[PDB]
């Protein structure tokens, strides 16, 4: 498949400096679930998108780079305050990681359980993150396309590559359900997942947090899976 197993995460290449990173919850009683987030050879350092849904999970994140890649992650940005996203904030932060989030996921964080990350992005009238938030980002270009799945979810494109990852916000094409909706913007999302696609027009591989990667049908679909909930 391209997937490779690393204790119990599984890590798959999807371009020559881009790792999609799989994690698994592991708790009493719920199944299985998959959380997808990113890892992006940047030159000489590594970036990080969304942590793991636990603290180990996160280290042997850190332990796969350290063994496979072998140089400094210089820095982390989370995608929302759900677990899944941002469940593994004090291994980060253990490991001298500078981390990153929307300011409102920070502002979030305590309500939801999570610890908050040491730095707050905020975002034009246009979606696109204040530059001065997001200092020497290198390929990562972030964009906040307006509530959704969550109202804090940000999304991020890989400059580059043919890439853009939109967090629990955009399910694959084949999706029965737009999944987790507890605190998703239902009036808002299928304009937000429409925002997400306008904003890199060019990315031909759409990386999601709970399926795997997929075409720009997997916008089109969300967006509608969006407005059908609306419409009810
Ligand atoms: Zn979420
Ligand atoms: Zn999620």
Redesign the pocket.
């Given at each position: 498949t391209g997937d490779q197993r690393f204790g119990d995460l599984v890590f798959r290449q999807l371009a020559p400096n881009v790792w999609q990173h799989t994690s698994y919850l592991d708790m009493p009683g719920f199944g299985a679930v998959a959380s997808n987030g990113l890892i992006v050879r940047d030159g000489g350092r590594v970036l990080v998108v969304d942590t793991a849904w636990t603290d180990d999970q996160t280290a042997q994140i850190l332990n796969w780079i350290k063994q496979e890649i072998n140089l400094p992650v210089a820095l982390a940005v989370v995608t929302?305050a759900?677990q899944?996203?941002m469940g593994g904030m004090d291994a980060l932060h253990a490991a001298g990681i500078a981390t990153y989030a929307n300011a409102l996921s920070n502002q979030l964080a305590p309500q939801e359980g999570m610890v908050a990350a040491q730095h707050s992005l905020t975002f034009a009238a246009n979606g696109w993150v204040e530059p001065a938030t997001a200092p020497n980002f290198g390929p990562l270009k972030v964009f906040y396309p307006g509530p959704g799945?969550?109202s804090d979810?940000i999304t991020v494109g890989i400059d580059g590559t043919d890439i853009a990852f939109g967090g629990?916000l955009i399910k694959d094409s084949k999706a029965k359900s737009l999944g987790?909706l507890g605190?998703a913007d239902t009036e808002h999302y299928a304009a937000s997942a429409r925002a997400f696609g306008a904003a890199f027009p060019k990315a031909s591989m759409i990386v999601m947090?709970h399926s795997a990667p997929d075409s720009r049908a997997a916008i089109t679909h969300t967006a509608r899976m969006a407005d059908k909930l609306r419409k009810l």
């Open positions: 929302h759900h899944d996203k799945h969550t979810n629990c987790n605190d947090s």
